[PDB]
Curated annotation (Swiss-Prot):
Lineage of the organism: Eukaryota, Metazoa, Chordata, Craniata, Vertebrata
TM stretches of this protein: none
Protein name per UniProt: Pescadillo homolog
Region (Sufficient for interaction with MAP1B): 8-100
Complete-protein stretch covered: 322 to 414 of 588
Post-translational modification: Sumoylated.
Domain BRCT residues, every copy: 8-100
Family listed: Belongs to the pescadillo family.
Taxonomic superkingdom: Eukaryota
Source organism: Homo sapiens (Human)
Outcome recorded upon mutating F13R: Reduces incorporation into the PeBoW complex and nucleolar localization and impairs maturation of 28S ribosomal RNA
Subcellular location: Nucleus, Nucleolus; Nucleus, Nucleoplasm; Chromosome
Assembly information from the UniProt record: Component of the PeBoW complex, composed of BOP1, PES1 and WDR12. The complex is held together by BOP1, which interacts with PES1 via its N-terminal domain and with WDR12 via a high-affinity interaction between the seven-bladed beta-propeller domains of the 2 proteins. The PeBoW complex associates with the 66S pre-ribosome. The PeBoW complex also associates with DDX27, PES1 interacts directly with DDX27. Interacts with IRS1 and UBTF. May interact with MAP1B.
Stimuli inducing this protein: By MYC.
Tissues of expression: Significant levels are detected in a variety of cancer cell lines, including glioblastoma, breast carcinoma, colon carcinoma and cervical carcinoma cells. Levels are abnormally elevated in malignant tumors of astrocytic origin.
Stated role: Component of the PeBoW complex, which is required for maturation of 28S and 5.8S ribosomal RNAs and formation of the 60S ribosome.
Length: 100
């Protein structure tokens, strides 16, 4: 791993943990969530460079193409990959209740 500071403690996704699936585009999301100072990981098997698995309660928000078909997990709230794009543009955390 690599350590280092960025500048200040002002990020839209400060601490917030996110997750991307093989269905949704990570190349875009990842780069984004990261640039916005957010945590994002993917399936180790899918591609190397991951930290936590999809079975880590730690995960606060989970991005998926079909949040309906697949059930949810206690504490964890699944949402579409559009919830993030709409947030970054609005520089605010939109109510996942709408994208659920």
């Amino acid at each position: 791993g690599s350590s280092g500071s960025s500048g200040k403690h002002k990020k839209l996704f400060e601490g917030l943990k996110f997750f991307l699936n093989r269905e949704v585009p990570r190349e875009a999301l990842a780069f984004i969530i990261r640039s916005f100072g957010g945590e994002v990981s993917w399936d180790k098997s899918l591609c190397i460079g991951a930290t936590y698995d999809v079975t880590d309660s730690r995960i606060t928000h989970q991005i998926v193409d079909r949040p309906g078909q697949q059930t949810s997990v206690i504490g964890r709230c699944y949402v579409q990959p559009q919830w993030v794009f709409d947030s970054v543009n609005a520089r605010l955390l939109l109510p996942v209740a709408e994208y659920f």
